[model samples]
Target: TITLDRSEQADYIYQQIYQKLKKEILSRNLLPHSKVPSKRELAENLKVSVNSVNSAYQQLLAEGYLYAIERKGFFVEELDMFSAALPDDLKEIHIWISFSHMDTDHFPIKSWFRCEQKAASRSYMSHPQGIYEVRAAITRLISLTRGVKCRPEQMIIGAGTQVLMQLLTELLPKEAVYAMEEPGYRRMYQLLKNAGKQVKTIMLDEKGMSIAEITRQQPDVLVTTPSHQFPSGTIMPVSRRIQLLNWAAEEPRRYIIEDDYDSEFTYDVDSIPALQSLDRFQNVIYMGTFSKSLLPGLRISYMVLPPELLRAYKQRGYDLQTCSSLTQLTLQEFIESGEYQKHIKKMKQHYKEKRERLITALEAEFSGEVTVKGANAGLHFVTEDTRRTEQDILSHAAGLQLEIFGMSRFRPALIIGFARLKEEDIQEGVQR
Candidate 1:
C-alpha cells in the first residue's frame, strides 16, 4: 500500500503524496509496472480530494517514475541509476577574511541603483582632475569626518591612489626626495621601487616615525599613515603630529602626505583626526580612498593639494581616462542623499560585532598559547601562534581554499581579517 502521514509535514498534500510514492518506488516496495490504485480509489482511501491524487499522479508520470497507457492505470518505470558519464554534485564553499574586503551582502544597492540609472542616462564628459560637483561633494564629507579643510579647485581625483601618487610625483619638483615608514605598506614600497622613485625608509618608534631620524634624513616629501599606521597599527599622538607639521613648515617646499588608510573603519576607539586638519602652514597633502568604504572596483581615490600644488596640477596638460563621470555623478548623488554616511554608520556597528566575535573566538582557540595585537582600528589584525608556524596555519586554510596571509616580512605572524567573512564562518573557521 502507498502509505503516508501528511499531518507531520507542512508541505502541500499533493506534493507529500508524490514524495511518498517516489520513496516507495525507489525503496523497491512498489515494483516496476505494478498496477497502483486509481486516483478516486487512492483519494477516497487517503481522505483527500481526487484532484490532489490526479496532480500527484501526473507529476510522477512526467518525471518518468510512472507511465500511463490508453484507458489503462499508471505503472512504475524501471530504475536507471547507472550512466556512462555520471554527474558530479559538489559545491566549493569558501570563506574569505585574508584582506580588507567589504561586506557586499549589506551594500545599499537600492540607493546605488537609482544613482547609477540617473548617471548612465546623463552626459559622458568628465575632467582630468574629476568633475567639479563631485569634488565639491567630497570636500563636505572630508571636513566632517577627517577635519579636513579644502576647496574643490584643490581637489584632484584619479582612478586610485596609485594613479594619483604617480601624478603627485610628477607635480612635485624633480629633485624632491620622499620618505615612508619602514615595514610600511609593502605594496607601496614596491610601487616606489618599480617606478624608480627615490624613497627612504624611516624607522618607526613607539610614538610613530622618529622625528630625530626625519631631521637627519631631511626628505622633501614624507608619506605617513598618521591616523593609524598600516600593518603596525600605531596611532601618532598630537605631539608627534605637531613635530611633523613643524618639520614640513620649516622648509618652504616640504610637504606631509597623510594617507588616512582604511579611514572608514574602527572597532574600539574613535578614529584620530587627520594630520590635514593640523597643517596651519598648508604643508599637508591629504589623500583618501573609496576602496575600503565601498567596492574597491569603484576605483575612486582623491587628494586635496595645497594651493601651491593646485596651481602645479593645473599647469600639467594631461590625457583623459580619469575616474568615470558616471561613477562621480552617482557618488555625488549618493553623498547628497546621505546614503554614504548611513552605510558607514551601519557598517561600523556590523564590523564591530565581527571584530569582537573574531578576536573572542581566536583568543579562546589559542588560549594563551599565542599573542594577538594590532586590533586598534581597520579591517584586519595579527595573530602569533607558538605551537604552529604561520605557514602551517596558512597551509591548513589553503587546503580548504580559504585565503589568508602570512606576515613574515614584518614578523612571525598571521594577518587575519574579519571584514569579508560572516560571523558564523569566522567562528567556524577558527574552530577548524
Candidate 2:
C-alpha cells in the first residue's frame, strides 16, 4: 500500500515490506544509513515470515539503500548522489510541525486525473513561443488578495520564499545590513548570514517585529514576515506597518521585504493586508508562496519587485534565472482551474478547527499549566507554561508516542506547533 509502483503478483508479503521501507525513505520519515528494524522485529510487527522480510532486505541492500553488519541490524543507506549529502544536522530533526496534507478526499481527484489524461492524450503542450502571462496572473492575484501594488513586469517567480531571500541577499551589497526578526525562521537567518550580508536581529513585541528596534538598527534592507510573524503568530498592526514604510522612505535606496508566507490561513479574520499596498515610493518587496497554501514541492513563489530593481534583475539575471517554463505553464493552468482557491479555503477552515481543538485539549489536560498564543492563524503556536522545561515536554511526549515542537534549540519553554496535528489527533496528542 505504501509503494507508488505497486505489484499484484503472488509476492505480496515481501512486496509489503519493500513498500513500507520505500515510503519511509521517500517521505524522509526514515533517514539514510539509520538502522532499520531488525528482520525478526519487522516480521513480528507486519505479521509476516522472517524469510519474506529477509528477501526484501536483500533486495534493498542490492539497490544500495541498506547495509548489514554481523550481529548488527540493517540500515538505510545513501542510495544515490542526492542522499549522500544529507545535512548531518537534519538527521532525526523535525524542524517544524508542517501542515502538509492536502485533502485528497476533497481533491476532486477524478476530475483532476481525467484532465491529466486528456491533456496527455490530446498533446496539450503549450506553444513554444507563447506570450507567457504567469507573472502577470500571479501579480494580479496578489494585488487583489493582499493589496500589493506592482506592475506585472515587476514580478519574478522563484522556488519559494527562502530561495528568493537567498537571491536578494546575493543581489544586495555585501556591507548592506539586512535586519531580520530576532527569533525568526532560523534557516533564513543562516541563509542571509551565509551570503555575507550584515544580519541584524530586530526584537519582537506583542504586535510583532519591533519597527522601532528595526529603525535603530538602520538596516539597508528589512526582511519581515508582516502578515503573521513566524513562531509567534503575531500580526504587524497598521500603524507599525506605516512606520516601516516611513523608515524605508527615510533611506533613499532602502527596501522592505514583506514575506506573506502563510497569510492565506488567517483564522481570526481576513488575512492582514500586505504592507506593500501602502507604498508610495515602491520600496516594499512583496513575496508570496504556494508552499504554505499548496504542496511544498510545488516549488512556486513570486515576488513583486520595485520597478527599477525588477528591470535590473531581469537584465542581469538572464543567466541566473529561477523556476522553469514548463512548470510555469502547469501552475498557471492549476490556478486557472479554480482548484487553488478552493484548496486554500478548505485548508484555512481545517487548520482553524484543528488549532481550536489543540487549544481546548491543552487547556483541559494541563489546566492552568499550559498557555497558548498565535492560534488565530498558522500551523504553529508558542506554548509557554511554568509546569515544564523544554526537555521535560519533549521526553514526556515521546514516552506517550506523541511529538510536539520544542523551542529549546534557540530558547526555552516554547512549543512551535499545534495546528500541524491532524484534526482527529490534536486532542489526544496534546493531552499532557
Candidate 3:
C-alpha cells in the first residue's frame, strides 16, 4: 500500500508515493515478506486518497517490490540480500590516474536529467542492444554536429580517452615500436614506455609530426593529433594524412593512432575527416573525448578500433573489466536523445566567444611585449619573444597572480590558457 511523507504534492502523486516506499525497501527498513498495510489503510494513515494509494501499490506489485494474495492485502517481495565483502585489512589503497579536470558547474544538468527521464519512463523494458535506430541517431548527431563521419559500430565508448589508450597499450605487442610526437602528452608517452614497448620520439613542426621522420624511425605505431596538434595548435594538411596512411600501408604491423581532441570548435579551415577514413589496410585507430568538447565530468569518450584489434579486444575484456553498465546506458541515451549535440553546439558558441574576447584583450595588453600565435582553436595559445626568454614572462605574469606557462615547459614560448580565464580577467592577466 502507498504511504508518503506528509509535506508533498505533485501531479504524479502515485509515483511519489511509490518512490518513497521503494526507498524504504531499498534501505531495508521494510524487510522481505513483511506485511505491508492495505491500500485503504495506508491512505488513511498518510491522509491521502485511496486511488492514489492503490496506484502506488500497483506499481510496486508490477516491479516485484510487493505481492498480493487472497486474504493478505500486500507484502514486501522476497529476495536474498547480502553485504559486500570487506577488503583484507590494508593492501595499499588503489590510486588511478586520470587527466580529466571537469567544470561541473556549467554542465547541462536539467536537460540531461530530462533525457534520462524520457528513456526511463518510455522504454524501461525494451531490448536496448543492437538497436540500429539509436546507433544511426549517434552517427547523424556526430556527422551533423562535429563533421566527423564515424559509422555506429566504429564508435566504442570509454570512461575517458586515456582509458582507451590504456587498453591500446595493453593490447599492442610488447615488442611493437611506438613513434610519439615530441613535446606531446606526457601521460601517453609514459604509459606506452612503462609498458615496455619500443618508444621513439618524433619532432613536430608548424604542420605536425613529420612523416618522413616517422619513416626514418620506422615505428610500428604512430600516435598524433592531425586537426590541431596538442600544445602547438598546428593543423596537419590532407597531403600529410595521405602520406601517413600510405606509409602505414607499406608495413604489415603499422598503424596510426589519431586522437582528435578539441577538433570540434574549428574557427579556420574545414574540419578534417578522421585518419581512419583513409585506411585501405584497416590500420588506423581514431580516438576522441568529451573532456574538451563538453563539460569534462561527463567523462565519456569513444574510439574506433580496427576490425582485427576489435576481435582481440573483445576476448581480452570479458567479465573482469569495463565501464559501468549504468554509465553506458546513460551515454547511449544521451547520444540517442539528441540533447548531447544540442549541448555541444551551445557550448561551442560560448567558448568561441570567450576565446575571441581573450584574444582581443591579449593583443592590446601584450602589444609591445610578445607575439601570440596559434589559431582560434582548442583552449590555449602559444606566445614568446626572440630577445626575451619565456621564463622572464612567466615570472612577471606569476607576480600578478596570472597563471602562465613558459617554453621551458615545452620548447621556446609561453602557453597561455585562454580557456581558463574570464574575458574580464584576460586584459589584466596579460598585463600582469
lDDT of 1 by residue, 142-177 (tens): 899889999998998888888888778878887788
Backbone clashes in candidate 3 total: 0
Candidate 2: stretches off by over 4 Å: 1-131, 320-324, 408-411, 418-420
lDDT-best of 1 and 2: 1
Candidate 3 lDDT over 1-432, as tens digits, reads 444544565647778888888888988889888998888888888787999889999999999999989996799987667789667895677741111112334568877677667656665412122233444555676666455555766556666777778777766665888998877776788878777788888998767899879988889999998877767777787788888989988968888898877777666544566666666787888787766654545666667667777667666644222444444555557777777777766766777787777667767766654577666676666665343565675566556665556545543576666444554455555455
Per-residue CA lDDT of model 2 for 1-432, tens digit only, reads: 333223546557687678678768777678777898888987787666799889889888887768888898888876443655889987885542332221323344554454455444544422221214767667667777788887777776776677777666655555887888867777778887777767888999987889879867778888888877876777888888888889889858798988877787788789777888888998888878876555434667877778777655656634344566655655565566776677678878877877777677777877655767664776666767355566886776666766555654533556545433556665556543
Q: What's the residue-level lDDT of 336 in candidate 1?
A: 83
Top candidate when judged by lDDT against the true structure? 1
lDDT of 1: 0.80
TM-score of each prediction: 0.73, 0.70, 0.69
The RMSD (Cα, Å) of candidate 2 is 14.6
**Cα-based lDDT for every prediction:** 0.80, 0.70, 0.69
Q: By the lDDT metric, which is better: model 1 or model 3?
A: 1
Most accurate candidate by TM-score? 1
TM-score of 1: 0.73
